[PDB]
Amino acid sequence: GSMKLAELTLESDDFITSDKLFNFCKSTIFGAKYVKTDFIKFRQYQYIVSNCGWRDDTDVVFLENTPVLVTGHSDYDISEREIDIIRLPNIRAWFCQNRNIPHPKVISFPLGITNKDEPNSEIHRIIGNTDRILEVSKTPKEIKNLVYMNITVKNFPEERQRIVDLYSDKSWVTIGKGEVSEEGHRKFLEDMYAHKFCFAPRGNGIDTHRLWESLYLRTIPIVKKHIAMEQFTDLPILFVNDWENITEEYLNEQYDIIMAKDWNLDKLKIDYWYQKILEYS
Ligand SMILES: [Ca+2]
Ligand SMILES: [Ca+2]
Ligand SMILES: [Mg+2]
Ligand SMILES: [Mg+2]
Ligand SMILES: [Mg+2]
Ligand SMILES: [Mg+2]
Ligand SMILES: [Mg+2]
Ligand SMILES: [Mg+2]
């Protein structure tokens, strides 16, 4: 229920991944179609799309006869470009990654954790290991420092270059050195677990894995305000107007407030989103 971030407890099957939602939608009894966002953005017909063999899905989708649409597995957003699909009266709900239009019919869902089962990707297999996240979350949370910073600036520099430039040299920041390996993943999670805060700026897409990775480890992610994030304001996320003038005093106060407040942490659990889709069946 409504509870404190510190009180969060996870089971092995709780973690949100887009594969779990995609798999959920394969059972057509639940009356929901999952399409990779690319096939919406680059549609060759206004109201007809297909996964074109993505996840071995060759079905042609007729959106005029689709009651619930679900899009993800893409850093692409849902924006004004898709307004003609959104205005279809037969569509009761559009569940999407990267909601970027202020329309009440479009419902954000968390990017969550990397899809471990991405076929020939060793990187997806390593970072997608939710067991390792679960294991670390059950160890004693021993705070080593205020904020964890482990950021590849390339993914979206206008924000990420400022974070590295402004805060790399702060005593209250620990710089993380990402090693893409089974040992490296464990070390990364342990580091992040031992901080009150993690920097979770947007990347190529608005939503990032770091945001969700942080919340499962009961570490507070820091994220720039965006319409894409506006339905997650009942999660203990530190939303910032910009990246300038973060201090030890500012973060210590935000820590005391966020940890004192009660949050809808059920939204971190895949079951929430299964039931939310079933609600529009
Ligand atoms: Ca301000
Ligand atoms: Ca500021
Ligand atoms: Mg649980
Ligand atoms: Mg899981
Ligand atoms: Mg992109
Ligand atoms: Mg509009
Ligand atoms: Mg590290
Ligand atoms: Mg800024």
Residue numbers in the entry: -1 to 279
Publication excerpt:
Protein A075L is a β‐xylosyltransferase that participates in producing the core of the N‐glycans found in VP54, the major viral capsid protein of Paramecium bursaria chlorella virus‐1 (PBCV‐1). The protein structure shows a typical GT‐B folding, with two Rossmann‐like fold domains, in which the acceptor substrate binds to the N‐terminal region, and the nucleotide‐sugar donor binds to the C‐terminal region.
To address the enzymatic mechanism, we solved the 3D structure of A075L in its apo form as well as in its complexes with the donor 1 and the trisaccharide 6 acceptor. The structural analysis of these structures revealed that A075L adopts a GT‐B fold, comprising two Rossman‐like domains. The active site is located between these two domains; the N‐terminal domain is responsible for the glycan acceptor coordination, whereas the C‐terminal domain binds the UDP‐sugar donor. In contrast to its earlier classification as an exostosin (PF03016) within the GT47 family (Speciale et al. 2019), we show that the region spanning from V66 to K222 does not constitute an independent domain. Despite several attempts to co‐crystalize A075L with both the acceptor and the donor molecules simultaneously, none were successful. The reaction occurred so rapidly that we consistently obtained the apo form without the bound product or intermediate, even when using the A075LD73N mutant. Despite extensive screening, only crystals with an empty active site or no crystals at all were obtained.
